[PDB]
Nucleic acid binder design. Structure first.
Ligand SMILES: [Ca+2]
Ligand SMILES: [Zn+2]
Lengths: 320, 368, 160, 47
DNA sequence: CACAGTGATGCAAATCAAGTGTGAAGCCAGACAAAAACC
DNA sequence: CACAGTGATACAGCCCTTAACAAAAACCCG
């Protein structure tokens, strides 16, 4: 490399002094293009296709969202993915998989707290911060020694932020759904979503050693799916997106994980009341979201169908 | 060749998988007897095998050490665990092991148990039942697996930790001054100790003792947290000295090569064993009068002999088979056909391939 | 492909004459190494090593032995490996991994019952046949209703 | 949601940190990632 | 009418080795010559 | 002294640029 500087330390000046005059000074792609045309004069047309496939990231390389989907969808943990990537790069010499810091940096595009969105009217008792991700589901419950002893751990998404993330990753599906129903792509009609909610506790999740509160060995998960999306065209209502396999494990999107007991009512109400406040606020407004170059408008309908008979009787206030 | 990780989950190779009770004897012998036949066959031969263009000859030495105490009692033809006859290496009674507590010698072997079962079955002196059981020293069955007398290290950890747990629970109640106690007083002592262990040592309480609990429990920090709850101070200095002795004597029977890495702790084992025994017989005679745990008898009496004979304990422990049990549930749920006529074959094949070292030089070839 | 000539017609000739009078006449090599230097001052070493991969022999294709070692050492299943292989081949074109049956036909070197051997005293009550692997563990127990009832399932290797 | 409970039992021990403090966020992030249609459509590369 | 695995098996479909001698196509040469999106 | 993870974080190390001196091998011929 130092002698490839020493031998080309005049032609390098020639190419940087021609780069500023012919196009403006783009030093990489002009010699790339000369290398393409030199393969043309040397008459290799498949090799230049492999070259442009590499320089678009296609012929190998594997753009890191695809490697993230591979690390996620085959239940690969990060340590096992690191082993696989490390020994594949050690054997083949090439870098087929991306290192996992690139996976981490490409991961935050889909986690909650990324996109801009505007409620119209603004939501009551909801801040307009658009970068709120995993927050403590206690929501600042007072843990002092003077008052009620809380012993649960919880983590949750803010409800509107999670609905924005779940509407933004299935953007392509909504566009293809309105395409297949002879609609436009620039349409920004008021979408009526319907969101199916479900909550069920679990048992025998073992408590760990170490520092923290006296956590019970039960967990409670709150989750939602997106069943249908219906836009109004003309007079009547057409649907755009439909969950094709509605009872999958691929579409029950998690919203809140707490280490509580659903038998207990105090800690359950304490953790769960922020989400009900957000949902009650969101029942009567509109969301504006930029979906593929166009701002479009959504409004929601929440259906709590996914509760068993015991939880319905214990929450809706009936007898046991 | 000398294996670097003798208790790994990567070096234990599966050989026979079956679905039967550990304690049901007949089907156990029905499956395991071909394996014993092949082993007693090939214990006297020379395997010729081509290794990279040259034939070479191998001989074999089989060492059965990865057996827990219950299975040694079951298949070596000895009595059950709670008998008067405790040790599977020496001939001594439970009351004799609480009077001498150190000086023994290894006497039980496999040929000796076979001849003793022949003595029991033939009854060649015409004695009664009890005089015959004294004559045969507790052998009442035919031993069908040859094993080496040794000490399982992992269960020695767990047993000694549970015995110290009971000592801690019995010292906060001052049972040496309250020799009678109800059920509920003992329950409350247990609950108090559980709360203070969670508050101090960050340990959640469990009913089945583990190994990580056993390593986190046998510290000096735990005896400080427990000494916070004793009213006296003679009990403080007694617990302090006793936990110091147990930590001086632990890393001889847990290290992979105690002749090299911890030699001065290996050398002081007899002196510290006599100190542990005299402390048990003096300052804890409310727990060790007329009885002892058989793991204390093994730990205090037979460890230097096993070290002198076999070089190391704990390299031969059953830790690797238990980590194989951790692999087995994973391979049964994730890497097998879900049919009752196919699952054992697929699981045996995968657990063979996972421990295969030819597929393990590849994953650390980046370290070349 | 055509309409970039009136902008590079000038630079090509001072590439040509310099590489003629300095190196000996190579042109593809001297625009190869200049793009290497541009990529490395650009600090894009991954595309540099991929260009090295297009120049030298391709590292496409792993051995079936190393895909087997990967698939069994990272606790992958065969269905998970199958859809990983399918996605990698359907996206990147070329076949980096190996299909399942190649791993199957290259795992038989590692299971027992593949290699030849003998015992110099032949062992009592076991055959000298050397291609037995996963055999039944019951060893032919009498499974009739007229016998001591058995209810277990057992699979074993031969010990030798 | 019951199949989600199966996924939760898997994700608690496979791909999350073992601590009482920051394991719920790891499980919640991974189970958020697993249910993304944008990543699931990459495993359908045959149209 | 839950739904994504769990791995071996077996049948079909796709690719390919090979002859040698063809076609199809990209592209070198420098120069001559119309479309077209801004002032 | 069981041991192979489980993920995030932090930091370090190695590799470009400037431009001028330097240790050093490869032939030429007095
Ligand atoms: Ca439940
Ligand atoms: Zn003994």
């Amino acid at each position: 490399r130092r002698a490839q500087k020493h031998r080309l330390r005049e032609l390098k000046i020639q190419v940087k002094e021609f780069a500023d005059k012919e196009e403006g000074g783009d030093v990489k792609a002009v010699c790339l293009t000369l290398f393409l045309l030199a393969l043309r004069a040397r008459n290799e047309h498949r090799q230049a296709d492999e070259l442009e496939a590499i320089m678009q990231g296609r012929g190998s390389g594997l753009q890191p969202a695809v490697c993230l989907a591979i690390r996620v969808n085959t239940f690969l943990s990060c340590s096992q993915y690191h082993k696989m990537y490390r020994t594949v790069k050690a054997i083949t010499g090439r870098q087929i998989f991306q290192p996992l810091h690139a996976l981490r940096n490409a991961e935050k595009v889909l986690l909650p707290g990324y996109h801009p969105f505007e409620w119209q009217p603004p939501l009551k008792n909801v801040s307009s911060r658009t970068d709120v991700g995993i927050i403590d589901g206690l929501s600042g419950l007072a843990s002092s020694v003077d008052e009620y002893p809380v012993d649960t751990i919880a983590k949750r998404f803010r409800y509107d932020s999670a609905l924005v993330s779940a509407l933004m990753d299935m953007e392509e599906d909504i566009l293809e759904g309105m395409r297949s129903q002879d609609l436009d792509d620039y349409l920004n009609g008021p979408f009526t979503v319907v969101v199916k909610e479900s909550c069920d506790g679990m048992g025998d999740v073992s408590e760990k050693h170490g520092s923290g509160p006296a956590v019970p060995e039960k967990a409670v998960r709150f989750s939602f799916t997106v069943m249908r999306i219906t836009i109004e065209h003309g007079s009547q209502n057409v649907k755009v997106f439909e969950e094709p396999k509605p009872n999958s494990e691929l579409c029950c999107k998690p919203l809140c994980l707490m280490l509580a007991d659903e038998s207990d009512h105090e800690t359950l109400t304490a953790i769960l009341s922020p989400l009900i406040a957000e949902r009650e606020a969101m029942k009567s407004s509109e969301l504006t979201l930029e979906m593929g170059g166009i701002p479009r408008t959504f409004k929601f309908i929440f259906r709590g169908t996914g509760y068993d008979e015991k939880l319905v009787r214990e929450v809706e206030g009936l007898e046991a | 060749f000398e294996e670097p990780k003798p208790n790994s989950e990567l070096c234990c190779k599966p050989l026979c998988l079956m679905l039967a009770d550990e304690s049901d004897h007949e089907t156990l012998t029905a499956i395991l007897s071909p394996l014993i036949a092949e082993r007693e066959a090939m214990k006297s031969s020379e395997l010729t095998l081509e290794m990279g263009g040259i034939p070479r000859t191998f001989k074999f030495i089989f060492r059965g050490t990865g057996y827990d105490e219950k299975l040694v009692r079951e298949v070596e033809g000895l009595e059950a665990s709670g008998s008067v006859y405790i040790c599977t290496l020496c001939d001594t009674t439970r009351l004799e092991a609480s009077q001498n507590l150190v000086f023994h010698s290894i006497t039980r072997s496999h040929a000796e148990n076979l001849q003793r079962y022949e003595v029991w079955r033939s009854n060649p002196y015409h004695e009664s039942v009890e005089e015959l059981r004294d004559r045969v020293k507790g052998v009442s069955a035919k031993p069908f697996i040859e094993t080496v007398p040794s000490i399982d290290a992992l269960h020695c950890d767990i047993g000694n930790a549970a015995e110290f747990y009971k000592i801690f629970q019995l010292e906060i109640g001052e049972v040496y001054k309250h020799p009678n106690a109800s059920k509920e007083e003992r329950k409350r002592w247990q609950a108090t100790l559980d709360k203070h262990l969670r508050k101090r040592m960050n340990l959640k309480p469990i009913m089945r003792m583990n190994g990580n609990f056993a390593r986190k429990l046998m510290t000096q920090e735990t005896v400080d947290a427990v000494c916070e709850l004793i009213p006296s101070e003679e009990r403080h200095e007694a617990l302090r000295e006793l936990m110091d002795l147990y930590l001086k004597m632990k890393p001889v029977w847990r290290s992979s090569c105690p002749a090299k890495e911890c030699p001065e702790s290996l050398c002081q084992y007899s002196f510290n064993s006599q100190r542990f025994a005299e402390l048990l017989s003096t300052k804890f005679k409310y727990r060790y009068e007329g009885k002892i745990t058989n793991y204390f008898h093994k730990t205090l009496a037979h460890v230097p002999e096993i070290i002198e004979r076999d070089g190391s304990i704990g390299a031969w422990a059953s830790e690797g088979n238990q980590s194989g049990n951790k692999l087995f549930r994973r391979f049964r749920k994730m890497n097998a056909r879900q049919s009752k006529c196919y699952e054992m074959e697929d699981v045996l094949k995968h657990h063979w391939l996972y421990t295969s070292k030819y597929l393990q030089k590849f994953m650390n070839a980046h370290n070349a």
